Design a protein around this ligand. Structure first.
Ligand SMILES: Nc1ncnc2c1ncn2[C@@H]1O[C@H](COP(=O)(O)OP(=O)(O)NP(=O)(O)O)[C@@H](O)[C@H]1O
Length: 280
């Protein structure tokens, strides 16, 4: 698919850099015709087929196609897409309250209430995506952003659809590997992947929300990956002595090696606690 080839600067004014990735730089921007603000994600294009720099057009188109499908309070939306010789520029819904990762860096540990407040929103967003057979494949606190970080119960949106795939056969068997701390054992072992990998990542996110500690993190990437494949984690009494056993049960049912035995997004919402890149 071809995108708009007018100069983006003719229609938007850019401001503060919001962040950057392996693939993109994201800048705050304001649309001239409406005064509304967006996050413009500039993704650097591959300059030759065999190149390793930039992102392949196939990968860019996949992120755009998925984003175009989404409309839900807990996920970002796509406003417009532009392109030029060097970049594809996605005009995304702006999430102005920063990453959950930075919010956590301030607070250390949350109460079970504060953790479940975030978690319910995360689960509602993932329920939406999984209902559409979209696996995110890179869920982590850096990919959850807050609309406003200065309210007692911040509202969130899931971002970063750079590894997201449609799972039309229940599993995909391609080159997909996210952040070692958060990937499921099937990613580590290069097995067919499905929606279940996100559910694992949610277990890791929950463990971190409650304790401020990462359950599989080793001193090198290979150690983290080996810990993940072996399901080498435990609830340290120093961090979890005052956490409810029901919270631990929720985590235990997500951090399961066999994807078929892992709780699904529907199971996670009915669970009693809730129910009301890889190389060095
Ligand atoms: N919609 C948004 N609103 C506000 N900030 C955002 C938004 N999207 C991305 N960012 C920031 O920009 C950073 C990079 O965006 P992201 O979509 O993660 O880029 P990427 O390079 O394609 N993937 P990765 O290497 O996994 O970060 C994020 O970690 C956020 O800090």
């Amino acid at each position: 698919t071809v995108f708009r080839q007018e100069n983006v600067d003719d229609y938007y004014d850019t401001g503060e850099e919001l962040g950057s990735g392996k693939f993109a730089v994201v800048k705050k921007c304001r649309e001239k015709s409406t005064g509304l603000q967006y996050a413009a994600k500039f993704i650097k294009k591959r300059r030759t087929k065999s190149s390793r720099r930039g992102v392949s057009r196939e990968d860019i188109e996949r992120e755009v196609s998925i984003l175009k499908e989404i409309q839900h309070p807990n996920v970002i939306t796509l406003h417009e897409v532009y392109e030029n010789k060097t970049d594809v520029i996605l005009i995304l819904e702006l999430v102005a309250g920063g990453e959950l990762f930075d919010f956590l860096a301030e607070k250390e540990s949350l109460t079970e209430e504060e953790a479940t407040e975030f978690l319910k929103q995360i689960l509602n967003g993932v329920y939406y995506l999984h209902s559409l057979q979209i696996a995110h494949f890179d869920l982590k606190p850096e990919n959850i952003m807050l609309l406003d970080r200065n309210v007692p119960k911040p509202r969130i949106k899931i971002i970063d659809f750079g590894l997201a795939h449609k799972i039309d056969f229940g599993n995909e068997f391609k080159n997909i590997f996210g952040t070692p701390e958060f990937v499921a054992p099937e990613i580590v072992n290069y097995e067919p992947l499905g929606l279940e990998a996100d559910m694992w990542s949610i277990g890791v996110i929950t463990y971190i929300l409650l304790s401020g500690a990462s359950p599989f993190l080793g001193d090198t990437k290979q150690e983290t990956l080996a810990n993940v494949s072996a399901v080498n984690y435990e609830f340290e009494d120093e961090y979890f002595s005052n956490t409810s056993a029901l919270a631990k049960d929720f985590i235990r049912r997500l951090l399961v090696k066999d994807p078929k035995k892992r709780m699904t997004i529907q199971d996670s919402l009915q669970h009693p606690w809730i129910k009301p890149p890889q190389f060095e």
